[PDB]
Structure formats: C-alpha cells, structure tokens
C-alpha cells in the first residue's frame, strides 16, 4: 500500500540552513530505505496548505514540514492528515504533532545571560520577523527574562527585528547606535545577521569585542568565516534533520515512539566576538 | 569488550561523522552501547546517539556484548580516527 | 506510462553551491509540474553509478546529473539509459548528453587577464581537486593561457590546490607567501575557498587590494559577507539549475532542442578586493 | 504595444526574480518578446531569457503583439517593479 517516498515541504533550499537540514533528512530516510520527494513553499501559507495536499495525494508514507509559523489552521489540516507527520526547526504551542527542535527559549536566555555574567550594562537584541512564533514567543522572552531575572530595564527599543540577510544585519548596528544609551553587547537571532551586525559595528570604527560584544546563534559555517570568529549558541540543524526523519520512520514502521515532542540538547561556541 | 576514548572532534559527534559511527554499528550482530557522564542508550541509534549530544573533550566508552564484541570493539576503533572523532 | 517525477543526483546539498542550484532545478520542475526524487552521492562513483540504477528504476520520465568528475565510464552507463539526462554544473568531454554549464576555461582566463592588465607581475592561482576535469582540464587552463598570451612564466608552483573549504583557502596563502617571488594579485577557483584567502593573508599583516588583489568565482553571497567585498566570476548557479531542467523539459515532453549542449553567458563582478 | 524600460537589479534579470517575469508571461494570451542589445527570443521562455543574460544598467524592450497587449505591457510593469528589477 505505501510508496517508500516520504515527502518533505521545506521554504527554500537555497539557504545553508533549510539545506543542512535537508541533508539530515535524506542521509536518514536514505539509511532506512526512503525516497523524499522536496518542494519549497517560500513560507507562502497558502502554498504551504496546497504543496501538503499535492504531496498527501501523490501518496507518501510521511511528511516532514518545516516553516517560520506553523498556522493555528495548519495544525486543524496536518491532523486531518492520513500519515504520520513531524515537524523540523518549527514549532506551534499544542504539541499535537511530533516535532523535533532545540530548547530556544533557553539558549536565548543562557546566551544574554552569558553577558550579563560578563559585565555587561546595554544588551541590545537583533531578530528576524517578529511574526514567527518561534521569535517573538520564545527567543524574544529569553532575552527579556535573563534580563528581568537580573533587574534590567527591558527597553523595546533594543530590540529591533530584520529579515534574516546579511545586509538587514547591518541596518540594526546603525539604528541601535543611534540610541542615545548605545549598547555594549548585541544578541543576534541567526549567524547571517550576526556577520553583518559585526561589519556594519566595524565600519562605525568601533572594534569586536573591545567595543560591543556579539553573540550569534545556529553555528552555521559563516560562524568561522569572519574576522573576528563568531561565537554562537550551537544549534544541530543536521542533527534535527536526522532524528526528525528518524522519528518518522519509527510513527511509520511502527516501533514504540519514547516521545513524539523532542528537543536535543544544545550549547554556546565561544570564539572572538566576545571576550 | 569495551574501550574507551576521548573525543577531539571540533564537532563532537554529531551530523554525518555521527550517522557514520551508527552506521558502522549496525553492520555488526553483537551489543553495542555508547556511555556519556554515566548515561547509557543503544550505540547503534541515531535518536540514542544523537540524545546525548557529546561536545569536545568528552570521554566516552564503546560496549560491546555479543558473538563478536572484539570484532566490533576492533571497526569501531578504525570508523572513529577514520573519521577524526577521538583518539 | 510516465510517472511525472524526474529525479536528481546532487553531490552534498549542504553546500550554498549545490543547493542554490537545486533550487533553480525545483523552481522550474514545478513550473512544469514535475516531482523531483532529490539524493546526494557526496562525489562517490561508486553511489553516483548505484543511485543511477535505483532512480532509473523507480521510473523516472528524467534525471538531472552533477558530478565533479563524469567518468568515462559513466558515459557508458549514461548513454544507456531508458530517459533523458542533462548534466548541470558539470562536464564530459565528448558531449554525447546535454549539459547546462558556464564558458569556464574562458571566464579563468578572463579573469587572469584582468589582473595582467592592472599590470601584475606574479599572478597564483589556488585551486580544487586537480582530479576534476572541470578544474585541471578547464579553469587552470585559462589561468595559463591568459599568461602565456601575456609572455610570463609558468610556474607550476604557483598554481597550489586545497578542498573547497575556507580552511584550505587560507593555508594555500600561507603556502604562497613562503615562495621567496611573492605574489601580488591571487585568482581563487571558489568564492569560499577565497574568502580564506582574504584572511589569512591579513592575518600576516597584509592588505587587499593594498598588498595582493585577490579575484573569486561563483559569485556566491559569500562575495559581499567579507571586507573587502570579493570580487567574483559571476557564474548563475541558479540560472544553471533552471535551465537545465528546462531543456530536459523540452527533451521529455518532445518539443525541439535547438542544442543540448548549452553554455549561458558570464561577467565579473568587481568590487573591492581588488583595485 | 511596447515599453522600453531600464534595469536597476544588481541581480539583473536572473534567478527567481526572472523566473517570475516568466511566469508572469504565460498567464496572458497575447505575444510577448524581450529584446536586449538587438536580440530578440520570446519573453514567455526561459531558456530564452536566460540565455541573453541582463546584466544591470541594461535598457530592456517589451513587446507585445495579441489580442491583450495593452492588459499584457501592463501588468508586466507591475510584475518587474513588484520584484526590483528596472524602472
Ligand atoms: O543563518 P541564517 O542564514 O541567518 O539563517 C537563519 C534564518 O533562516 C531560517 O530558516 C528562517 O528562514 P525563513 O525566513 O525562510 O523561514 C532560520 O534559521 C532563521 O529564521
Ligand atoms: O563556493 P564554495 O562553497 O567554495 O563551493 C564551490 C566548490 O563546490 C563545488 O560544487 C564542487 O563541489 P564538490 O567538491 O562537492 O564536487 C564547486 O562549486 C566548487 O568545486
């Protein structure tokens, strides 16, 4: 009855991140004998319903999704669904479908935390789309309670979003030197944006860390790729491909699911942007 | 049966280095399992492997019980410095 | 009798190049309403031949194809085959299959010539795996005949190779620096790989363009995530993608090939790492 | 029947950017052709626009010939200013 074709809905492989993931994905479904069938969705809500369908139809054992806001009405679609279905790096507060992500609202907050710790006065937070739940919900918290949790003056104004690019990241920099109370230490959502708030710190004249420290997140390669090296909070993209797709092949073979809601573990890499 | 290391991998043992070293454990018949800071889980699941999250520096010992442990505890050996894991 | 699923042999989809490829391929798969069966080979001939079998088994109305080296044999074995087959990004000699690539021994020598006519003595070239006809058989050429049009001598020290990687990229520097003639302008097989150059060449206390003009490929966004801004090879991984899928459109939908061996255009792009 | 335009897209014509000019040419019914340096291929097909290769700064013509024209040249204005690619 089955099609050993597991299907994937993905926003754009074009990005290092949504492409580590997918190759979690495929060395897995590959270990176990499934072919994927990928298809990108752009993060258009209503593409993202239709690709679910086209993909549901063409019969597919599962479905891995992945998405930057799984909709209160996706969640009504993906259990009407007739396979199993767990979601990667994505995440949506009712936990009726399995998902394999990172603790974020922790390491947002072991990050911040990690720079109070180092003395720090102004800490500034640089995130993408606000719209997202993982954002707002749990990355932006984190920072604000490892602040809260310390006495400090939870500022709406240092923290100023961007979509996920390099040159976003550079924008930030400036509107955040732009306060009269300048930051000593910047937290940014995602490695790209973190490159750019480094240059666009640097071409200011000001120096990493000497001047404001920074912190990114994912660990992606562009981590190494700079000068200063970035220091990241670890996050295993190939890791949560794996075990996504892993998971799925236990809901479909039919093994004993310990739980369908996971979170692997994570850390911070401390490089150069911050002493 | 067993052998321990100490893991000098930058990436510790995770992504495809990682599937590797489970992948080179379901070849064998015998029981293996990988133990970090005393916790135990089969070496030869992904899930259990990649649970446990080994950073860097982290010593960690190979188990292996069955008809073949010492031919098992052998490859290991090799799929671990053929990968740049441990030493 | 068909199955409205090509499928795509892709070496590593982790890699900004391969993916950024993969997605030009999708893209247009979709605008033609085709499933895609994605799978990587990591460069093993062994599972580039195998993953050839399984796809072509599944019934496949077509195959995509990229390869750092084709192999003569896989000629063999591509000539055999039930379906229409388009290499991308990739080369072969004897262009009995289509292939969607880049004039490249014409943009290597383009850009070597444009550093002779900014008047360079020493010119090097760091390069990847000698082993790829791509690589030793087109890009080293231009690199030597750009020279040897000019009258200057070939030095087979000059040219130094590594992986891909950032890594390798900074150690071919190093490596070219310890020559007793230094060099004073450097031509990068990758974007990447000269993002390493950049680097560790200022690690030593140099300056680009300053000291040594360096000159990329690809064109990836890796080219504006530096200081300086690399200058680069423009070469439309994405346009490749697209069009590769398009003509193996063509060639399965029976419309009329104008050619299947086909070669879109290529500039540079000059920004600052290099005066 | 036609508009000639000017491209400001450090991109140029290419990637998705193209991909949706493209796209945006199918849906009417009349004849569409882009014409760059003097060279002309059907503004409908990819390999076409592709193959011309629109670098940046580059003016650009849009002809269309049908029994929609004035609907098509319309909504490609919006279609190329929508994606940032001339003006
Ligand atoms: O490391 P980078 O290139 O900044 O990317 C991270 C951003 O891309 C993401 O996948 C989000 O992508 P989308 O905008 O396409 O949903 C996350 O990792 C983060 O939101
Ligand atoms: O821009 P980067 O990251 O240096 O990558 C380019 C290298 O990757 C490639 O796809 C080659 O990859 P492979 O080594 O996996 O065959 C080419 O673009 C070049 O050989």
């Not at chain 1, 998902?99 to 974020?104: G, H, K, L, Q």
């Not at chain 1, 990241?169 to 955040?176: F, N, P, S, T, W």
């Not at chain 1, 009269?180 to 230490?185: G, H, L």
């Amino acid at each position: 009855k089955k099609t050993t074709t597991v299907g994937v809905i993905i926003p754009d492989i074009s990005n290092i991140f949504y492409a580590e993931l997918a190759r979690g994905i495929e060395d897995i479904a590959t270990m176990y004998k499934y072919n994927i069938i990928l298809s990108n969705s752009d993060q258009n809500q209503d593409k993202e319903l239709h690709l679910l369908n086209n993909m549901l139809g063409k019969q597919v054992d599962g479905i891995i999704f992945m998405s930057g806001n799984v909709t209160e009405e996706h969640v009504e679609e993906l259990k009407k669904s007739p396979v199993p279905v767990v979601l990667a790096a994505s995440i949506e507060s009712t936990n009726q479908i399995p998902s394999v992500t990172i603790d974020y609202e922790q390491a947002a907050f072991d990050a911040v935390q990690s720079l109070i710790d180092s003395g720090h006065k102004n800490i500034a937070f640089v995130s993408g789309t606000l719209e997202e739940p993982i954002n707002h919900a749990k990355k932006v918290k984190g920072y604000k309670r490892a602040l809260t949790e310390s006495g400090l003056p939870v500022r709406d104004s240092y923290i100023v979003e961007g979509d996920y690019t390099y040159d976003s990241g550079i924008e930030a920099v400036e509107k955040l030197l732009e306060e009269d109370e300048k930051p000593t230490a910047i937290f940014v959502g995602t490695d790209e944006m973190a490159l750019g708030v480094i240059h666009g710190a640097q071409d200011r004249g000001l120096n990493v860390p000497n001047d404001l420290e920074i912190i990114g997140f994912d660990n992606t390669r562009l981590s190494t790729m700079v000068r200063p090296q970035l220091t990241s909070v670890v996050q295993p993209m190939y890791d949560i491909g794996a075990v996504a797709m892993r998971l799925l092949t236990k809901y479909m073979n039919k093994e004993t699911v310990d739980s369908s809601i996971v979170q692997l573990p994570h850390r911070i890499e401390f490089r150069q942007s911050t002493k | 049966a067993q052998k321990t290391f100490t893991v000098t991998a930058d990436s510790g043992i995770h992504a495809r280095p990682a599937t590797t070293l489970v992948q080179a454990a379901s070849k064998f018949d015998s029981d293996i399992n990988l133990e970090f800071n005393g916790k135990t889980v089969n070496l030869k699941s992904i899930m259990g492997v990649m649970s446990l999250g080994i950073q860097k520096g982290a010593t960690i010992t190979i188990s292996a019980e069955g008809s073949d442990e010492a031919d098992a505890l052998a490859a290991l050996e090799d799929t671990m410095s053929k990968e740049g894991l441990g030493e």
